[PDB]
Amino acid sequence: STGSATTTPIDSLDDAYITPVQIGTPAQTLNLDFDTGSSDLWVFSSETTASEVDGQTIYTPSKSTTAKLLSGATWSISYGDGSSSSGDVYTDTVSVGGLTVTGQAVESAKKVSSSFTEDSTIDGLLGLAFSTLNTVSPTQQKTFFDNAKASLDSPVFTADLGYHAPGTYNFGFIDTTAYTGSITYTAVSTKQGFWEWTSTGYAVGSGTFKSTSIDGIADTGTTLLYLPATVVSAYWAQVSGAKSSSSVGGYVFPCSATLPSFTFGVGSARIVIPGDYIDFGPISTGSSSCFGGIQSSAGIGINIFGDVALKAAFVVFNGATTPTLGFASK
Numbered sequence: 177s178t179g180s181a182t183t184t185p186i187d188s189l190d191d192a193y194i195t196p197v198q199i200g201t202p203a204q205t206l207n208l209d210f211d212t213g214s215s216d217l218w219v220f221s222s223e224t225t226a227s228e229v230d231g232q233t234i235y236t237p238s239k240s241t242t243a244k245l246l247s248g249a250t251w252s253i254s255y256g257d258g259s260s261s262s263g264d265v266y267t268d269t270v271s272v273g274g275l276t277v278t279g280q281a282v283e284s285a286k287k288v289s290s291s292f293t294e295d296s297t298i299d300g301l302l303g304l305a306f307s308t309l310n311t312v313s314p315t316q317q318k319t320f321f322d323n324a325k326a327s328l329d330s331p332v333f334t335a336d337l338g339y340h341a342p343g344t345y346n347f348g349f350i351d352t353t354a355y356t357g358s359i360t361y362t363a364v365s366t367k368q369g370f371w372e373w374t375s376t377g378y379a380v381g382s383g384t385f386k387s388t389s390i391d392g393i394a395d396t397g398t399t400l401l402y403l404p405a406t407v408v409s410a411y412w413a414q415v416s417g418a419k420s421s422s423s424v425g426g427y428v429f430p431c432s433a434t435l436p437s438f439t440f441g442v443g444s445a446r447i448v449i450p451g452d453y454i455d456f457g458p459i460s461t462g463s464s465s466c467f468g469g470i471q472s473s474a475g476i477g478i479n480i481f482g483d484v485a486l487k488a489a490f491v492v493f494n495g496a497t498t499p500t501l502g503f504a505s506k
């Protein structure tokens with residue numbers, strides 16, 4: 177089997193992407209944030225505290241003839257941006273782009289933090305990291321991909337995120353028309369539960385490539401590219417007037433600037449992020465200070481190849497017995 181679904185930016189600056197997901201019988205379609213940095217499929221629901229729902233589409237398990245309470249199971253998750261959610265668990269039929277999994281754990285939110293309530297465009301998350309990170313207790317549950325894997329034509333999924341435009345998540349096949357050149361594959365460590373890999377270096381604009389190992393994660397659920405402070409300083413030094421602002425929370429730059437590209441290495445291959453991809457717009461409406469798309473990871477503990485980086489590539493998440501990542505230009 178295969179599946180293919182379009183993913184659409186939630187807003188004008190690609191803060192996140194939403195993909196329609198069919199849950200239950202008859203189908204209830206929710207728009208979920210596919211997140212290769214986490215491993216829970218959770219949804220706003222008829223159980224979510226009413227004051228914490230503001231415009232989201234909810235899953236109502238009592239209206240699904242295939243829903244079953246997973247007795248005793250609870251979940252609770254916190255994300256790198258400080259947001260969180262928690263609740264109980266049903267199993268139900270879940271379909272993405274024509275690919276169907278029966279008995280998928282659908283984690284129903286009883287509580288969500290304010291940032292979720294305040295974002296009416298995201299109805300939940302669909303985790304695509306390794307199932308070792310799934311938070312369901314006392315019986316850990318498998319991700320949608322883990323459940324689908326054995327049925328897929330090939331045990332892979334691909335992320336093809338658009339810049340200010342829709343893109344595609346495919347399951348079970350590589351679309352050889354979706355990229356240019358060749359796909360360069362690179363080793364993955366699953367020891368932290370992430371799609372963790374080592375970039376071979378970087379360049380700023382037309383500058384020379386610096387060969388240096390940068391361990392980080394391929395994370396579709398993170399908006400920005402978070403890299404070591406040395407790398408980030410080297411980038412923003414090429415933008416007149418750019419500076420790190422503690423009050424704003426990162427590097428800002430004059431909105432009048434033209435940003436240089438940023439290149440990252442994948443083995444001997446190179447992925448070029450155009451400068452425009454690094455612009456996240458005025459820090460507040462009407463400001464002439466703009467919030468940068470490359471930020472320091474120093475306070476995180478891990479480097480994160482988020483959407484800024486991934487949207488410059490066609491990315492293969494190869495879930496074979498020994499997982500690997502592939503990157504191609506497009």
Ligand SMILES: COc1ccnc(NN)n1
Nearest residue numbers: 399456457458459460467
């Ligand atoms: C994409 O993250 C952020 C954070 C803060 N400000 C902005 N854009 N003005 N983007």
